[PDB]
Structure formats: structure tokens, C-alpha cells
RNA sequence: AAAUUGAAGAGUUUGAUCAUGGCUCAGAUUGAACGCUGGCGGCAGGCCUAACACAUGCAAGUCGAACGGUAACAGGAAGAAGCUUGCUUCUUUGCUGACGAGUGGCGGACGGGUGAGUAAUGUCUGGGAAACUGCCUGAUGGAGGGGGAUAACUACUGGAAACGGUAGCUAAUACCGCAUAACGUCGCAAGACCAAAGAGGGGGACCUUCGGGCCUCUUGCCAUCGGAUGUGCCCAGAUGGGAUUAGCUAGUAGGUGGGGUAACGGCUCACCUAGGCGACGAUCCCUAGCUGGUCUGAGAGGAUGACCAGCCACACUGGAACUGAGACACGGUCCAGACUCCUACGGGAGGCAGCAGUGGGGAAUAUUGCACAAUGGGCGCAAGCCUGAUGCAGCCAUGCCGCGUGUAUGAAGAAGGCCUUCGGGUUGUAAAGUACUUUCAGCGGGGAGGAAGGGAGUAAAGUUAAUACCUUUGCUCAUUGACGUUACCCGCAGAAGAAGCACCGGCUAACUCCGUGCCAGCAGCCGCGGUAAUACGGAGGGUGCAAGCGUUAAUCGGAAUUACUGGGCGUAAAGCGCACGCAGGCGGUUUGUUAAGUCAGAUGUGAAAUCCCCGGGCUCAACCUGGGAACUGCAUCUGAUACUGG
């Protein structure tokens, strides 16, 4: 129910950083980002249309880190909402909650972040949610609970999230480690590199 | 007010029934072209007025025979 | 018969089969009686003989035997037969 | 009817139940039907590593 | 005779009963002539439990339906609420 | 307000192109099977074959508040013993609490199972009358007087057994007349005729022969009119294939009379008429349970009927009737048959398509489990009993959904594998290392909720001559869980116990070396293999899915490749050789009417579940669930008059 490989890999078969790690060290630096993996890795082809629709569904894929049928569940669910597809696509995939502990920055990175909710240590409106694929709502608190307010790794990630840029749909207090998500986020507060027509013409092929 | 129906008179050759054809328009449930669809009736009545060419009202009653089970209200058309 | 109240019903309805045979003959008895007399063409007889004939098929529509519309319709068809006696 | 029969090497007799399961060869000539290998009674290839479901053959360790 | 009773409809270790107008030699998840209201044994705090037509209730009641004794309960206590 | 937001192509004829045209794949779904692999949890599902046969246990009983009565119990008494002069007791007494057997009332027609039959006697939808309706409820009144039997038991008794037989007994709410009778049945009427049953609780007063008559309250019983529910019945439409099935039908179509049925009806007869059904598919053959739905589809449709729910049919095969409100009766009766079993050879018994399970068949589908704690049912005034329905547990990766197998740092880019233009690349931040966490499995502790009721006592009120009895309303008490070592919470110690399968020539994401040499083999199609095989086998690397992955089967899509939406006919398959013409289809133009088709509003209805839209809960999801539209229909009323029809 996860992927436990190596994951510039995957970062390194899309090519795009998929912010797989923390940021102390330049990923550039930690891979060899240049090439691709394997052994013919120095190839770049003519990039299909399967070929190019499919990067772009596991792009988003791995740096999500949901697997195919939660995936093909959040396209169900995306394409029967209201509203345009694609939006409501990257809504959901907001909405997870170990991506709001990784925007909050309780968590390094978000399989850390993973770890971090799974381990029984988050508190939504003070209830203990043991579970990563958790819904989060509108105008809703979360935050730690007290047996896990002394880790240092949760320092250390809110440390290293100050030290990145900010999410804006967020309110954050981490001297209390907690925060609220204030609304639903929009398709332009996100980044830019993550296209939608091609995923939601590969789920609707 | 009465739910009654009227059609047409192929024969009356047996005493005291004769058989209706009812030609109801109905439309063609896949196609769409409204065709015609002519249901008989063992129609009974009394003292044989009717013949063939007929145009019969006719309404429900409690069965009178095996498979006759409509009585007339009213008859116009007597002739050709 | 393997269950004790299908023993007992059993039972039970062997005694009231012989119980309503009996009944049932009586009423079949009488009622051919009154038609003998009606086919017989003699009023006075038949009159009384259908008089002798009404108690007791009534006495059996009360008690359940047969139906009310049973008994209502051979009285009523007795009756039309006296009549056109 | 006739069947083929898959896999590099095989060990069947006659007198020896096995189990079909369809899908034409194409290029024999009348026969419709593979031999289930690894069924019941036609066990699976000699130290063959990939593609093991297909030809009924345990994992290697 | 016609009853009003409790129909158990859910899954394990948590039930939801809805009542019914029901024939008597039916099923339990049988036909019904007309469904009234339903009772949630395990509905938590600050919602509704339990919501019985009264109207159709008493109606059926003047019709000659009968009760059952865990909505005869439940009619007790619907009252007691008020 | 919302109930939608919905449609992909590709390979392959050819030297090459366009077109027609098949063939195959890419998607979703499964009651699934098999191969490899296999940590947990939630909820669902689990003989589709042989409707094949069954060992063994259980699946329908209950009522002493109907009845005689005691087969065992336990309370109460009497007699007598070492007296253990107050007891261990042994006999009689149904006196009491109870209760095997037996009569009787209700229940076994519900609940459960299966889909063989049936192409319409069934089903779905809308109408209709000529009907019955135990239990439940509303109203109106009755509720007297008697009698004869027969089980249980007694004695004899046939029989191996199952089952009986005789002679006597005994009672009831069993049975039967009698008295009675309306607005009940027959008749237009006069008139005639028709019913029954008590039991229990408490007793003030008169009072019993000590069983009490009498009073009071509960619950029964009868007749009738009702109500609701259910069941029977009829009509109309729709409900597979085939015209290499065009004739069929003698109770057959109708009439009149009789009979019968709860009820109309050839339902059944006598007699008469000679009809009826049929190219809008009768008859005949083959297949099939049908529907709400489910899968797919953008939609129209196609396939299909697993679980769930409604209806029908059947209960070893073929029949027939009784009892009963209701059966022509799953665990009832009677007859015949095959099978299995017992026999004293005379005769007998049985029917898992109830739940488990077995044998067999099969590719394939589970435990001879716990409980009535909950819901519902049966009886009961109740307490309560029975409940293989149901609630749960066991199994199975059968599906859907959720989670875990760590996280971070980490270049000596370690070794080792593999490749190399012998620079090196790659495995690869991957491993080692150091730091941080303990979800789930394991260990120990706390523990909700499913439980509302029921049983005692008291208070108030209602009856009541009555502060008794009973019912309602509260009020204190111990209380009632199979699941259960429960859901969930808390503490422990450690990265420990937890990753595989398919594929890599194109379609189709993913490439190089080595072993072969038209051999071995792969294949879903095109094609590969004949000495450099990206297609076979192995390695390294990768891609895709992931506690699953595939191969097969089966449906739909793509297939506009049966085209109504949505095809084509000169040459690709396709215009009858040509004309006449009945039925059928279509019909110029003006007016008037009708309003059948059409449209529009309302009414009834489209069972609930599901699908969908908003919402609620199980920490999330699956799942459960509230409200809503939809339920593209059918019928009725009411309109409008352009088109079509008369
Ligand atoms: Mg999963
Ligand atoms: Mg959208
Ligand atoms: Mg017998
Ligand atoms: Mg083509
Ligand atoms: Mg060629
Ligand atoms: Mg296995
Ligand atoms: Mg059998
Ligand atoms: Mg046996
Ligand atoms: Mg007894
Ligand atoms: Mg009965
Ligand atoms: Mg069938
Ligand atoms: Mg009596
Ligand atoms: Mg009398
Ligand atoms: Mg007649
Ligand atoms: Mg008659
Ligand atoms: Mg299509
Ligand atoms: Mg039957
Ligand atoms: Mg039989
Ligand atoms: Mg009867
Ligand atoms: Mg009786
Ligand atoms: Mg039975
Ligand atoms: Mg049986
Ligand atoms: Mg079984
Ligand atoms: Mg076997
Ligand atoms: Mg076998
Ligand atoms: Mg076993
Ligand atoms: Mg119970
Ligand atoms: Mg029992
Ligand atoms: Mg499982
Ligand atoms: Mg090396
Ligand atoms: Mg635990
Ligand atoms: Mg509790
Ligand atoms: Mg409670
Ligand atoms: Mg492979
Ligand atoms: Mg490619
Ligand atoms: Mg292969
Ligand atoms: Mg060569
Ligand atoms: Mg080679
Ligand atoms: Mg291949
Ligand atoms: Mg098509
Ligand atoms: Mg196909
Ligand atoms: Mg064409
Ligand atoms: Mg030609
Ligand atoms: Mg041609
Ligand atoms: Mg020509
Ligand atoms: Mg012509
Ligand atoms: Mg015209
Ligand atoms: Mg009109
Ligand atoms: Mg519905
Ligand atoms: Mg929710
Ligand atoms: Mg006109």
C-alpha cells in the first residue's frame, strides 16, 4: 500500500524534482538528474502519446504518493463533482491529509509526513486520525497531540518548511505545532508543471 | 365517463356475440412510426342487431362465456 | 407422520372426515328428497318436503359445514322450482 | 480433441489426467486448447526463472 | 393482523430498525403496506435517534393495526420527549 | 436551487495509395476457476454441474387461566421406630406448586429451500366485479334449557415389529338436538328457518349441603353490518427464437335449460346453432422461471436475472381428496412406482431442492459451531417455552475499500553483479553507517454501546356497594449478552515479523549482453527462429500493477461490423427479368365540425432496496442511513386546435 524503493528514481525518470526530499542538500547534487535511470539512461526518444499521457498521470502519482485504484477513485469522485475536472482532481489530492501535514510542514517530506500521521500523532479537531488518505474540510483545525510534541523531527521539518516557500490556503501557528485549513485551494495557487487534460483524457480513454 | 371503446364489425354468424375489431393507434416502441394494431373482442349482445360494417361502443362486463366478456352501450353505422 | 401434532392431527382428521361424511350425507339425502318431489310434479308434497329440507341444511350452513351462499342458493334454487311447479 | 502442449519440454503419457484451458495456437492446424502446466498432473519446467505463473514453477531461493 | 414493528436493517454489531405497517405472517424484511419512521439503537449525541409519523401511526392504530413491544416502548418515549 | 459534466483509437490485404471489408488488441465487470505469491482489518459473497443419492444430530410447537386426571418431582399433612419426642424418615391424600401421557383450542397453508416445469393458467403495468376473509379492530344486540357418547385408565387380546381389536368405564370451551331471532338467509311479499361456553381473579351483604348459588372486574363464545389486511377471478397492453412448422379446433365458438363453485364462466352435463382461432404468425418444435434490477453503453440499446425484495411453480416420481378461515398441504393422510433399510418371510418403514455434513459428479464453492441477549414469528391473560428464521462466531486474497513492510541523514558515488569505445557507466542515496518513530501482528491493563424491557413491592386515578381484584401512570430494589480475551483508549520493547507477479519487436510504458541455430520454442494479431535473435531460454537494467499479479472462460464496448438515433446498392456483397394488382404504407388544395393521434395542467399510480442530488454516522473509505427528484410508463379528469386522422 505504499512504495518503498528508491526514490530519485523516480525523480529521476521524470526528470522534474518531485520534492521526494527535504532540502538540506541540492538533489541535483544527491542524483545524477541529468540522465535517465537504468542502464540506457543517456536515451531520450520521440516520447509517445501513451508515453506522454502516462508521465504525466505518475508524475502526479509518485508525488502524491497514491497508488492506481485511489487514484482512479479520486477521478471518479473528481469527475462527478461539480465544477471543472481537473480542478477537482488536484482538490482532492490537496485534501488528502498527509499532503495538509506536508504543507503545514509538521512532516519533512510526504511520505515523513506519511509515517508521521500514521503513527498516531494527529490530532483533527483534537480527534486522533491513525489514517494518511484522511478528507480534510474547510474551515477545520490540525494539530499535534502531546506525546508527539517533543520530537525533534518535527522541529527539524518546520525548520526546514520556514526555510521554503509558504502554502497560501493555509494558516499555520507552529508554536502550538497546529493550524487550521482555511479553504478548499484553487487550481492557481498550486504549481504549474502539474498538467490536468492529460490525466483526465487518460482516465477517460 | 365510462371507460368504453368502440371498433369496427368483422362477423356475426354465431347467436347473441360478435366480434369487434377494435384498430387502437399505438407507437412503435423502438422505431417511432405510429402503426396500427386491430384487437378482437367477443362482443355479446341481445336480439342481433348488428351485422358486418358496424360500428360498435362497447363496454366491460363480468364474463358472460369462456371468452366473451364485452357488452355493447350504444351502435352507430348500422349499414355499409 | 413424524412430528406428535402431526400424529394428533391426523388423528383428529380421520374423526372429523367420518364425523362430516355423516353430516354431509344427511344434507345430500335430504336435499335429493325435495328434487325427487319436484320432478315428481306434487306440490303439496314437495312444499312440505322442502319445509322438512330448510332447518337442516341451515342448521349445517350455521355450524360451518358448508358455505351461507351455499345454502342461500339451494334454498333460492328450491324455491324457483316450487314456483314453477 | 486435441491440444496443445506449452512450456520447453514436457513429461505426459497417455493414461494421465490433465487440465485445458483454451486459446488457439495459431499455427497448428486444428487444435484450439493449451495443457494447464503446473496442473494436476504435468508439472512445470526444468530451472525456468522467468515467467514462472505461466508454466507452474515455485520460487527459486 | 397488521402490526407496526421493527424491520433490522444494517450490518454486523450495528443495527438500524425501521419501522413498518407490515402484515403479520410476512417476513421481517418483508413486504410492508407503508413505512412510517425508523429508530437508530447506536445514533450518538446532538442528532436525531428516533422519527415516527405519529399521524399515520395513531391512523393505522384507529385502522385496527396492533403494536409491537419495542415500538410500543418507543411510542412511549417519543410522548415522554414531549 | 441541484439530481448531472457526454463519445479516443491501433495493427493487418498492397511494390505503394485510397476505399469497401472482415480478423485481433487496448476498457469495465464477474457467483468465477487455475498458476506463482501470501501481513492485518472493515463490509459483503460462497455447489452456476446431477431437480444425483443420503449416514448422523437438530429445523414446530404451545396452553393446567378448556378438561378429566397423576407418569416422575417438591411443599403440606396423618401413623411408628433405635426415638436424633423431634425428627433421617416409610405409606395414604391432586390438597397445593406443577406435569410425562391423553381429549380439546390455536399453530403445522407463516418463516426457510430450489428453479426442474411453464413462451403463457405465469410475470409487469393500468383498469373491473360476480366474491370469500381465522387472528386484529368499530358498532348493534344475545349468551337459557338439556342429552348421548368417546379417548386417558381397567381387564382380555392379535402382532416379531409398526399397528391394532374386544368388553367396561369418565369429563370439557369436544359432539348433538331443544328454547330463542333481528336490520340475518329464501321469497316481491305474507310468511318460513337459523346460534352459543365458559374460565380466572377477589370478596362487602343474603348465604352453601362448605363443592358454594350471589356481587364485582378481566378475558373468552354466538348472530349481523362494517373497516383494514390477505386470497380467489376477469379484461387490455407488453413479455424468446423459427415459417426448412399453414392450417388448427368435437366440449371445440356461442345459445337455452339443469347441476356445481366462496364467486362469473363449457366449470360441468342435455339439446340446438356451426362456429371460433390464422400471415397483426394460429398450430407445431427447441430453449426459458418473470419482475424491481445488475453489468456495459455518452445515449438509444445489448447481455443477464448471483446476493437483496415482490410474484409464480415444486417438495423422491405420477395422481386423488380430507381436515381447515387458508392446502388439493416441504418436515400431514391415502394409492401406484424405482431406490435404500428392518423382518420371526406374514409383513413393515423412509424421502435434506430446511441447517450442518457425507458419498458421487465437477475446473469449482465452507463448521455434523454458540445463543434466543436483539428483531420478528407460534402458543400463552402472562411469566415462559419452541424458534438451523435471525444475531454472531469458523473457513476461503471471491470482490470492494483501508492500512502496514519504516522515516531522515548518508558519496568512501564502498564492495559485489552486469555492461563497456577498457576513460568508465550502471546497480545507486540504493545498501553499510548514525539519528528519530512504533501504525498493524505480539505482550499487559481499562473498557463503552448494542438493554429496551421483565420481576417484586409502594403512591395516584379509573372502575367498583368496595380503600379488594385488574388496567394505566410514576416511584426504590437486585437485575437479563452467544458475540467478548468486544469497538475503542492507555502502557511495554525493538526496525524487528511482514513484496510479489506480468511484461520489455509494433500495437503497448519498458534494452543490452550471453546460450543457441527453421532446432528448442514463443504467439492476442502482424509474424519471429536458417551463426551478431532488442520477438525463443538466462542474466543485468527497466516499465506497469501491488497483497495481489496474470492465463482462461463469459458479456458489453471499440463494432457506424444489423445503422431508430446511426450504414449501403453502376464497378467493392447488394435493384426482383419486366409489368398488372388485392391487403398494407403514404397521400394535392379550401372551408366547417369532431377531437382519435399530438401537446399542456391536475389526479391516481409507478412497492421498498438499488441508480443519482444534497445531507448524517462507522476516526477515513467500502458500508449503513435521512430528505429529494427520477421511477423516461399506464389510466382518469380537464383543456388547446397548428399538423395527422375521421
Ligand atoms: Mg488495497
Ligand atoms: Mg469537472
Ligand atoms: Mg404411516
Ligand atoms: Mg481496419
Ligand atoms: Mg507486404
Ligand atoms: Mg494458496
Ligand atoms: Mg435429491
Ligand atoms: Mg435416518
Ligand atoms: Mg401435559
Ligand atoms: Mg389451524
Ligand atoms: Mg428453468
Ligand atoms: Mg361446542
Ligand atoms: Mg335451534
Ligand atoms: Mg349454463
Ligand atoms: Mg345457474
Ligand atoms: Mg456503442
Ligand atoms: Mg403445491
Ligand atoms: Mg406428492
Ligand atoms: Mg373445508
Ligand atoms: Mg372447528
Ligand atoms: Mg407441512
Ligand atoms: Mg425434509
Ligand atoms: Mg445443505
Ligand atoms: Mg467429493
Ligand atoms: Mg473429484
Ligand atoms: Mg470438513
Ligand atoms: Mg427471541
Ligand atoms: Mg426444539
Ligand atoms: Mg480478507
Ligand atoms: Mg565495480
Ligand atoms: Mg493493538
Ligand atoms: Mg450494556
Ligand atoms: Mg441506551
Ligand atoms: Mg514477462
Ligand atoms: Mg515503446
Ligand atoms: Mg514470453
Ligand atoms: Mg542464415
Ligand atoms: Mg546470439
Ligand atoms: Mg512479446
Ligand atoms: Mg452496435
Ligand atoms: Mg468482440
Ligand atoms: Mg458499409
Ligand atoms: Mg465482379
Ligand atoms: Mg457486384
Ligand atoms: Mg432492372
Ligand atoms: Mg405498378
Ligand atoms: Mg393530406
Ligand atoms: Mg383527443
Ligand atoms: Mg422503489
Ligand atoms: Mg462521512
Ligand atoms: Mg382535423
Given at each position: 500500500?505504499?512504495?518503498?524503493?528508491?526514490?530519485?528514481?523516480?525523480?529521476?525518470?521524470?526528470?522534474?524534482?518531485?520534492?521526494?526530499?527535504?532540502?538540506?542538500?541540492?538533489?541535483?547534487?544527491?542524483?545524477?538528474?541529468?540522465?535517465?535511470?537504468?542502464?540506457?539512461?543517456?536515451?531520450?526518444?520521440?516520447?509517445?502519446?501513451?508515453?506522454?499521457?502516462?508521465?504525466?498521470?505518475?508524475?502526479?502519482?509518485?508525488?502524491?504518493?497514491?497508488?492506481?485504484?485511489?487514484?482512479?477513485?479520486?477521478?471518479?469522485?473528481?469527475?462527478?463533482?461539480?465544477?471543472?475536472?481537473?480542478?477537482?482532481?488536484?482538490?482532492?489530492?490537496?485534501?488528502?491529509?498527509?499532503?495538509?501535514?506536508?504543507?503545514?510542514?509538521?512532516?519533512?517530506?510526504?511520505?515523513?509526513?506519511?509515517?508521521?500521521?500514521?503513527?498516531?500523532?494527529?490530532?483533527?479537531?483534537?480527534?486522533?486520525?491513525?489514517?494518511?488518505?484522511?478528507?480534510?474540510?474547510?474551515?477545520?483545525?490540525?494539530?499535534?497531540?502531546?506525546?508527539?510534541?517533543?520530537?525533534?523531527?518535527?522541529?527539524?521539518?518546520?525548520?526546514?518548511?520556514?526555510?521554503?516557500?509558504?502554502?497560501?490556503?493555509?494558516?499555520?501557528?507552529?508554536?502550538?505545532?497546529?493550524?487550521?485549513?482555511?479553504?478548499?485551494?484553487?487550481?492557481?495557487?498550486?504549481?504549474?508543471?502539474?498538467?490536468?487534460?492529460?490525466?483526465?483524457?487518460?482516465?477517460?480513454? | 365517463?365510462?371507460?368504453?371503446?368502440?371498433?369496427?364489425?368483422?362477423?356475426?354468424?354465431?347467436?347473441?356475440?360478435?366480434?369487434?375489431?377494435?384498430?387502437?393507434?399505438?407507437?412503435?416502441?423502438?422505431?417511432?412510426?405510429?402503426?396500427?394494431?386491430?384487437?378482437?373482442?367477443?362482443?355479446?349482445?341481445?336480439?342481433?342487431?348488428?351485422?358486418?360494417?358496424?360500428?360498435?361502443?362497447?363496454?366491460?362486463?363480468?364474463?358472460?362465456?369462456?371468452?366473451?366478456?364485452?357488452?355493447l352501450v350504444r351502435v352507430v353505422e348500422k349499414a355499409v | 407422520?413424524?412430528?406428535?401434532?402431526?400424529?394428533?392431527?391426523?388423528?383428529?382428521?380421520?374423526?372429523?372426515?367420518?364425523?362430516?361424511?355423516?353430516?354431509?350425507?344427511?344434507?345430500?339425502?335430504?336435499?335429493?328428497?325435495?328434487?325427487?318431489?319436484?320432478?315428481?310434479?306434487?306440490?303439496?308434497?314437495?312444499?312440505?318436503?322442502?319445509?322438512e329440507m330448510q332447518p337442516i341444511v341451515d342448521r349445517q350452513?350455521?355450524?360451518?359445514?358448508?358455505?351461507?351462499?351455499?345454502?342461500?342458493?339451494?334454498?333460492?334454487?328450491?324455491?324457483?322450482?316450487?314456483?314453477?311447479? | 480433441?486435441?491440444?496443445?502442449?506449452?512450456?520447453?519440454?514436457?513429461?505426459?503419457?497417455?493414461?494421465?489426467?490433465?487440465?485445458?484451458?483454451?486459446?488457439?495456437?495459431?499455427?497448428?492446424?486444428?487444435?484450439?486448447?493449451?495443457?494447464?502446466?503446473?496442473?494436476?498432473?504435468?508439472?512445470?519446467?526444468?530451472?525456468?526463472?522467468?515467467?514462472?505463473?505461466?508454466?507452474?514453477?515455485?520460487?527459486?531461493? | 393482523?397488521?402490526?407496526?414493528?421493527?424491520?433490522?436493517?444494517?450490518?454486523?454489531?450495528?443495527?438500524?430498525?425501521?419501522?413498518?405497517?407490515?402484515?403479520?405472517?410476512?417476513?421481517?424484511?418483508?413486504?410492508?403496506?407503508?413505512?412510517?419512521?425508523?429508530?437508530?439503537?447506536?445514533?450518538?449525541?446532538?442528532?436525531?435517534?428516533?422519527?415516527?409519523?405519529?399521524?399515520?401511526?395513531?391512523?393505522?392504530?384507529?385502522?385496527?393495526?396492533?403494536?409491537?413491544?419495542?415500538?410500543?416502548?418507543?411510542?412511549?418515549?417519543?410522548?415522554?420527549?414531549?
Amino acid at each position: 500500500a505504499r512504495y518503498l524503493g528508491p526514490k530519485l528514481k523516480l525523480s529521476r525518470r521524470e526528470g522534474t524534482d518531485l520534492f521526494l526530499k527535504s532540502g538540506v542538500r541540492a538533489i541535483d547534487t544527491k542524483c545524477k538528474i541529468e540522465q535517465a535511470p537504468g542502464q540506457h539512461g543517456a536515451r531520450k526518444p520521440r516520447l509517445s502519446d501513451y508515453g506522454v499521457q502516462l508521465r504525466e498521470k505518475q508524475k502526479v502519482r509518485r508525488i502524491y504518493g497514491v497508488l492506481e485504484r485511489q487514484f482512479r477513485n479520486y477521478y471518479k469522485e473528481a469527475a462527478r463533482l461539480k465544477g471543472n475536472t481537473g480542478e477537482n482532481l488536484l482538490a482532492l489530492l490537496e485534501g488528502r491529509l498527509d499532503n495538509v501535514v506536508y504543507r503545514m510542514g509538521f512532516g519533512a517530506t510526504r511520505a515523513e509526513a506519511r509515517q508521521l500521521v500514521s503513527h498516531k500523532a494527529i490530532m483533527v479537531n483534537g480527534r486522533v486520525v491513525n489514517i494518511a488518505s484522511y478528507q480534510v474540510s474547510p474551515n477545520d483545525v490540525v494539530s499535534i497531540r502531546e506525546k508527539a510534541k517533543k520530537q525533534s523531527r518535527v522541529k527539524a521539518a518546520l525548520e526546514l518548511a520556514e526555510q521554503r516557500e509558504k502554502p497560501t490556503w493555509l494558516e499555520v501557528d507552529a508554536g502550538k505545532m497546529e493550524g487550521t485549513f482555511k479553504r478548499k485551494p484553487e487550481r492557481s495557487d498550486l504549481s504549474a508543471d502539474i498538467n490536468e487534460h492529460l490525466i483526465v483524457e487518460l482516465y477517460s480513454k | 365517463k365510462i371507460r368504453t371503446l368502440q371498433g369496427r364489425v368483422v362477423s356475426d354468424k354465431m347467436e347473441k356475440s360478435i366480434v369487434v375489431a377494435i384498430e387502437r393507434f399505438v407507437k412503435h416502441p423502438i422505431y417511432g412510426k405510429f402503426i396500427k394494431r386491430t384487437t378482437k373482442l367477443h362482443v355479446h349482445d341481445e336480439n342481433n342487431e348488428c351485422g358486418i360494417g358496424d360500428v360498435v361502443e362497447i363496454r366491460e362486463c363480468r364474463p358472460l362465456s369462456k371468452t366473451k366478456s364485452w357488452t355493447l352501450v350504444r351502435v352507430v353505422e348500422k349499414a355499409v | 407422520a413424524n412430528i406428535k401434532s402431526a400424529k394428533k392431527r391426523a388423528i383428529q382428521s380421520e374423526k372429523a372426515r367420518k364425523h362430516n361424511a355423516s353430516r354431509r350425507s344427511m344434507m345430500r339425502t335430504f336435499i335429493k328428497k325435495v328434487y325427487a318431489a319436484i320432478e315428481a310434479g306434487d306440490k303439496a308434497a314437495a312444499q312440505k318436503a322442502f319445509n322438512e329440507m330448510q332447518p337442516i341444511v341451515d342448521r349445517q350452513a350455521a355450524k360451518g359445514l358448508i358455505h351461507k351462499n351455499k345454502a342461500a342458493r339451494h334454498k333460492a334454487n328450491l324455491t324457483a322450482q316450487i314456483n314453477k311447479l | 480433441v486435441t491440444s496443445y502442449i506449452g512450456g520447453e519440454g514436457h513429461n505426459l503419457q497417455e493414461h494421465s489426467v490433465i487440465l485445458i484451458r483454451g486459446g488457439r495456437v495459431k499455427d497448428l492446424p486444428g487444435v484450439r486448447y493449451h495443457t494447464v502446466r503446473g496442473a494436476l498432473d504435468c508439472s512445470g519446467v526444468k530451472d525456468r526463472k522467468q515467467a514462472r505463473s505461466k508454466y507452474g514453477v515455485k520460487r527459486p531461493k | 393482523m397488521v402490526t407496526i414493528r421493527l424491520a433490522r436493517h444494517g450490518a454486523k454489531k450495528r443495527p438500524f430498525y425501521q419501522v413498518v405497517v407490515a402484515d403479520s405472517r410476512n417476513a421481517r424484511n418483508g413486504r410492508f403496506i407503508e413505512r412510517v419512521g425508523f429508530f437508530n439503537p447506536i445514533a450518538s449525541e446532538k442528532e436525531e435517534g428516533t422519527r415516527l409519523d405519529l399521524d399515520r401511526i395513531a391512523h393505522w392504530v384507529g385502522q385496527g393495526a396492533t403494536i409491537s413491544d419495542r415500538v410500543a416502548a418507543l411510542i412511549k418515549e417519543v410522548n415522554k420527549a414531549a
